[PDB]
Amino acid sequence: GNDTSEVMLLDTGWEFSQSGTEKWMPATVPGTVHQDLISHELLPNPFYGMNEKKIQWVENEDWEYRTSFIVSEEQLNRDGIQLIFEGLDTYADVYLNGSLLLKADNMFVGYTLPVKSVLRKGENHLYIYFHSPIRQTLPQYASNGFNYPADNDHHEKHLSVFSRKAPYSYGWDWGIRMVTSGVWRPVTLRFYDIATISDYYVRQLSLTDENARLSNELIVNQIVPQKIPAEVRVNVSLNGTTVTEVKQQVTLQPGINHITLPAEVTNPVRWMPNGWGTPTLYDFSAQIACGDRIVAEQSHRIGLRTIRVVNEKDKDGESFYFEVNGIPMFAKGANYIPQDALLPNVTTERYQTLFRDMKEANMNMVRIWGGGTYENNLFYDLADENGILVWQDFMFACTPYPSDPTFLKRVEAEAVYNIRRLRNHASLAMWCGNNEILEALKYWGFEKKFTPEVYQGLMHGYDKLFRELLPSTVKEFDSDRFYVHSSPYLANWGRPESWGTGDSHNWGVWYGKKPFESLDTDLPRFMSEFGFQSFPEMKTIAAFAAPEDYQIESEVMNAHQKSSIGNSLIRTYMERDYIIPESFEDFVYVGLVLQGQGMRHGLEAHRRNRPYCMGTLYWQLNDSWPVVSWSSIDYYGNWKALHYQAKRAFAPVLINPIQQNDSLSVYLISDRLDTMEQMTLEMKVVDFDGKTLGKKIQVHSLEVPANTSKCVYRAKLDGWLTPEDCRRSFLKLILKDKSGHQVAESVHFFRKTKDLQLPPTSVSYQMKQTDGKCELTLFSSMLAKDIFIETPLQGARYSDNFFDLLPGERKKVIITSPRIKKGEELPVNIKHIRETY
Ligand SMILES: *[C@H]1[C@H](N)[C@H](CO)[C@@H](O)[C@H](O)[C@@H]1O
Ligand SMILES: [Br-]
Ligand SMILES: [Br-]
Ligand SMILES: [Br-]
Ligand SMILES: [Br-]
Ligand SMILES: [Br-]
Ligand SMILES: [Br-]
Ligand SMILES: [Cl-]
Ligand SMILES: [Cl-]
Ligand SMILES: [Cl-]
Ligand SMILES: [Cl-]
Ligand SMILES: [Cl-]
Ligand SMILES: [Cl-]
Ligand code: NA
Ligand code: NA
C-alpha cells in the first residue's frame, strides 16, 4: 500500500467485438458481454416478460476485448512490472505486444504475470479472446459417453460440470440462464523496486484474556539478481495508535523468500459477533525496508477471537454448533446467493445495504452457498466490521462432478488461491465441500439412470474431490478452521431416524407439502436450509410484467417461476390458512403475509428447542433478478414480510407463545451474555374493539438466564376462552424488569386467520414529508390484521411494516429514501386482511 510502487488501473479505453464481424464498440471493464450489448441496445432487457429465450444466442458466439496504454521511459526502468487479472470468465487467451501471456481456464483464480521484458516505451496493446464456454466444452461432452445429472443446468447438454465457472450462470430453480463472459474483476499494472509481498498471513497461535500470540508469515518475491540487505517490520495498531512493533534483519535472495516474525498483544480486545459486543479490528501492516525506502507494504484488518465448530457423538446422535470466544452461540441468519445475473453490475452501495439488511434483522451468520462465487474482498470486509460469521461452501452444488487429473489440478489452483485470499478475515468460520452432492448420490435415484460401472465411477470420484483434495488443502493452508465434506453430511428430510445426526436441509416444507406446524415436531441439531416461496410486491412485478399477465399461472408468471411445484403450490398453502382473494394484487399481498408467518413459526421452533437445536439459516436471503422465490428481500432491495418477521424472531430477547393440543405454553428465549432477574410476564385478552376480557394475568419472580429457552407458563384453553372468544380476541404479552421497564412484547391469535371474525375497518393516517423522509401516524379503532404500507418508490426503507395495528393504539412509522422530496406527496396505500374479501 504505502510503499514506492506505482499502480495504473486499466479500467478505461476498452472495446469489444463479436468474433468474425470486425465491428468494434466501446465497453465497460470490469463488466460482461451481456451488459456491453445492452448498453448499445443489441439485447432487450433480459429480465422483462418472455425475453429469456431472446438472449440465449450470446452463449454460442466468441468475444474479443482490446485496450491500449502508455508506458514512460522512467516506468520501464523500474526493477519489476506485474499485470494482475483478479478474474477472467472463463476460457481467455491474453495477448500483450505479440506475446501469449496466459491461457485462462478458471473464473475463480487471480493471475499475477511478469511483463517488464514484453512492455514497450509508448503505446502498448492488450487483446483478450474469450472462447464460448459452450463451444469449448461440446467436444468434451461428446467424449464423455453420458450426461451428468445437473437438473439446474437449463439445457439438453449439462456442460456446467466441465467448467470452473459460477454454476447458477447456466440456470437455477430461482435463476435466469445468462451464460456470460468477460473481465469480471479489476485489471492492474504495478511498477516497483526490489520485491513484492506475494502473501501476508497473520496466524493466531493462542488467545487468552491475558495474551494473544501471533506469527506474521510473509512470502516475498525478489525480482533483481543481487543479494539485497533489508529490514522486515510489522506494526500492530488500534484506531491509529501503535500497540506493538517488531523487526528482523534479512538479506533477500533472488526468487521466493519465507520470513516469519512473532508478535504478542497483552490484554487483547476480542472480536465479538453481532448481539454479543463490538467487532473490534486491529490494523496489521508489514513493510520491506531497503535503506531509506519502503519497497513493499501489505496490511490486513485482524480480529482476535476463537471459533470452534463442535461436531461430536452425544446422547441425541451428533452435535453441530459454533463456540465463539469459549461460549456456545445459537446461529441466526440465511443462505446468500449472487445479487445479480451480471456480477460486476453489483455496486459497493448494494453490498453495504445487504449487510445493513442482515445486521438490522439481528443476524450473526451467513452461508455463501456453493452454486454462486467465492465473494469479493468487500463482502468479507463488511462481514468483519458487522460481526457476521461466514460459512464458505466451495463452488460445487447438486450434481456429481468429474474427478480426472486435469480437472482436479484446476480445482487445487482455485482452492489454494481462495483459501489464501480469505484466511485473514475475522468473519470466516468454516469451509464446506459442496451443497447436497452426497444426498444426491445416495437418494435421488442415480442407481437407475446410469450403468453400474458409471455409478461406481461417480462414487470413487466424490471421495477423490471432497474427502481427499479439498480437506488436505484446508489442513495445509487453514489448519485451525473446520472443514465438512457436504451440507447436509448425513441427515435426510425423508428419514426421521437421521434428524439427530449433524445439520438438516428440511425439504418437508415446500417440496414435501408439509404444513408449517410440522416444524414444531420435525427438529434438527442445526437447520442449514429450509424455506417457502412468495411473489414479490406489485412494484417489482410491474418491472417484468403487464396487467394482461396478472394471473398465478399466466405464461409470464410461469416464466418467472423456476421450481417444479410452481405458483399453484402457493395457492394450495394459502387456502389452508387464509381466504383466497379474487384480485391478483390482493393475492400477492396475502402471499407475502403467508411466507412471513409460516417461516417465523419455524425460526421460533428452532430457537425454542435449544440446546437440542443450535442454529437456523433459512433459504434464502436475496434474489439475482425479478422472480418468484424463497427470498426475504426482492431483487430491488425491498423487504418482504419475511424479513420483518426474521428480525422479530431473532430478537436477543423473545416471548414465544406456542399453542398445541388446545393448550398455550409461553417460553422466554435469550441470546444475551447476562442473566435477567426478578422479571414479570404480564398477559391480557383484548377483543377486536379494544375491550379487556377478564383481568390481567401476572407471573412474577421470573429468571431469564443467559443463552437459554425456558417454559414459564401453561394453561388449557377449555375453561378460559369460549370458542366464540377465540375467533374475536387476541393475547397481548409483555416482559418487564424489577422496576417495571418493558424489555419485550408479543401478540397471539388463537385460530387461523381465515377463521377470525375480522370487523370491516379503514386505517386513517396523518403524513409529515420532508427531504429524504416521510413520518406516518396510523389509527384504526378496530384491529387491522397484518397491514402492508405500500408505496411506488423502489428500495424505500420502513422503521416497520407487515404488523397488526391494534384497536385504538396510534402507531408511528418512518419511511426513508434519498428520492423523497419536500412538497411531492409520496403515494401511500394501506392494505389489511379484512379488505381482501
Ligand atoms: C435447496 C432449495 N430449497 C432448492 C430445492 O428445494 C434448491 O435450490 C437446492 O436443492 C437448495 O440446496
Ligand atoms: Br518483471
Ligand atoms: Br510476477
Ligand atoms: Br527463504
Ligand atoms: Br472485486
Ligand atoms: Br472429510
Ligand atoms: Br390448538
Ligand atoms: Cl536495510
Ligand atoms: Cl448472537
Ligand atoms: Cl451410463
Ligand atoms: Cl385463475
Ligand atoms: Cl399467532
Ligand atoms: Cl374492510
Ligand atoms: Na480480488
Ligand atoms: Na436462541
Residue numbers in the entry: 27 to 863
What do the paper's sentences say?
To test this hypothesis, we performed an extensive soak (10 mM, 4 days) of BtMan2A crystals with compound 2. Surprisingly, the resulting electron density map showed similar diffusion of electron density and rearrangement of the active site, with the ligand observed further displaced from the expected GEI in a highly unusual 1C4-like ring conformation in molecule A (ESI Fig. 2B†). In molecule B the ligand is 4C1-like (similar to the complex with the alkyl aziridine 3) and part unreacted aziridine (at occupancies 0.4 and 0.6 respectively). We thus conclude that there exists a more fundamental instability in the GEI structure of BtMan2A, possibly explaining earlier failures to trap it.
Exo-β-mannosidases, hydrolysing non-reducing terminal β-d-mannopyranosidic linkages, are widely distributed carbohydrate-degrading enzymes. All of these exo-β-mannosidases process their substrate using a stereochemically retaining double displacement mechanism that is characterised by the formation of a covalent glycosyl enzyme intermediate (GEI). We show that these probes covalently label exo-β-mannosidases from GH families 2, 5, and 164. Structural studies of the resulting complexes support a canonical mechanism-based mode of action in which the active site nucleophile attacks the pseudoanomeric centre to form a stable ester linkage, mimicking the glycosyl enzyme intermediate.
